[PDB]
């Protein structure tokens, strides 16, 4: 009667910009992970600290679904211990991550004639994100010594950049929709179980 709304997460019309990655909480529901795992839709379903074929047998206190768009060659950065613009400045997983990273090619949705430029990432940041940190700030980045005082100029940069998703892009520059499932085990009754 009370099914986890993984449908709503995976079948959303729009996904978040990775710099402003969307988090949903899933609790107190029956989860069918087999329907996800066996789906023809996904080209990545990579897990850490849990076997995906065992998920229907497990109970968790909560499941968090983090979702966003990146380019194909950045899907590798969505894993523990990775570096690069996305891992360092946008979305960081911890070394001790217990979860699954699910990705599918979204060229048919997130690319269009004359290119789609609705999806943003953080290009500049003074320090690397902590695990599960979100920075949605739009302050001018100081790359030099002369004060920016809130204005773009010499060594003074707007910190966000748009992806250019043209349909004819190579697969590494095509948009991928990513869902990161975090399987949380608190010292509390489990609320999210497989069938």
């Amino acid at each position, epitope marked *: *009667t*009370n*099914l986890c*709304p993984f*449908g*709503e*997460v995976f*079948n*959303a*019309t*729009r996904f978040a910009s990775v710099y402003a990655w969307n988090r*949903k909480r899933i609790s107190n529901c029956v989860a069918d992970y087999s329907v996800l795992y066996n789906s023809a839709s996904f080209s990545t379903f990579k897990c850490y600290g849990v076997s995906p074929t065992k998920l229907n047998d497990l109970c968790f206190t909560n499941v968090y679904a983090d979702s966003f768009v990146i380019r194909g060659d950045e899907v590798r950065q969505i894993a523990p211990g990775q570096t690069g613009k996305i891992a360092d400045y946008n979305y960081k997983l911890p070394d001790d991550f217990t979860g699954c990273v699910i990705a599918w090619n979204s060229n*048919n*949705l997130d690319s*269009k*004639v004359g290119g789609n430029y609705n999806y943003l990432y953080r290009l500049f940041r003074k320090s690397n994100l902590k695990p599960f940190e979100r920075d949605i700030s739009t302050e001018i980045y100081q790359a030099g010594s002369t004060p920016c005082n809130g204005v773009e100029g010499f060594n003074c940069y707007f910190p966000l950049q748009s992806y250019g998703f043209q349909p004819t892009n190579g697969v590494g520059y095509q948009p991928y929709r990513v869902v990161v499932l975090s399987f949380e085990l608190l010292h509390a009754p489990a609320t999210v179980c497989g069938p």
Partner: antibody
Amino acid sequence: QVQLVQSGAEVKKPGASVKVSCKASGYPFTSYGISWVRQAPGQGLEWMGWISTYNGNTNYAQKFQGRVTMTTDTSTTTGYMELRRLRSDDTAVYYCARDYTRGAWFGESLIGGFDNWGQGTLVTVSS
Amino acid sequence: EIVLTQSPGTLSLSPGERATLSCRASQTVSSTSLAWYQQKPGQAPRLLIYGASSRATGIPDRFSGSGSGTDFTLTISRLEPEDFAVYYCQQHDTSLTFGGGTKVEIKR
């Protein structure tokens, strides 16, 4: 299989109210919103609004705002559409449909439409 | 609001022929959010196509949706007698609106 079954035909006077029922079966009720559409005799489809079966959140077309109330009874997996202060031009077949355009749990836009429409309920409003 | 304009008002065709139905939006509609419906006489509407090009559960192969931006198309590749009906497009990009409908009638 999936079935939405609506209440029988209604004949109402101007200024009266009508409450149409929509009994759902064959699927997880709280996983899908319910959407309501009406069709005046020989006319097109007019969207009335949307209700979450999960949290009871509603979105109505501006034309019906302050006149329409959508509710659900979870135990009987039934949706209701109440339209008040009826006038002759509310005469139409009223349809409920299983919604996959807005999420029941999170209320965000979905890749889908209205499926498994009810058989419709004719409401005639006349002096 | 996003207004959907369907053309033609009436398609006059024979069984076995190809039907091309047009739905034009007054503004850009995300292809995720464009659906097509069939209404046979005396029956409730039926979902054919969602997300511009995905066919709903149990919908025959002869029904295909295409297009993007403001120009959408429903194609019935080989009309069966059961396909002579009214077809409605629908967008939920911004609020929710329907097209005025296209009638597919038997040519004689």
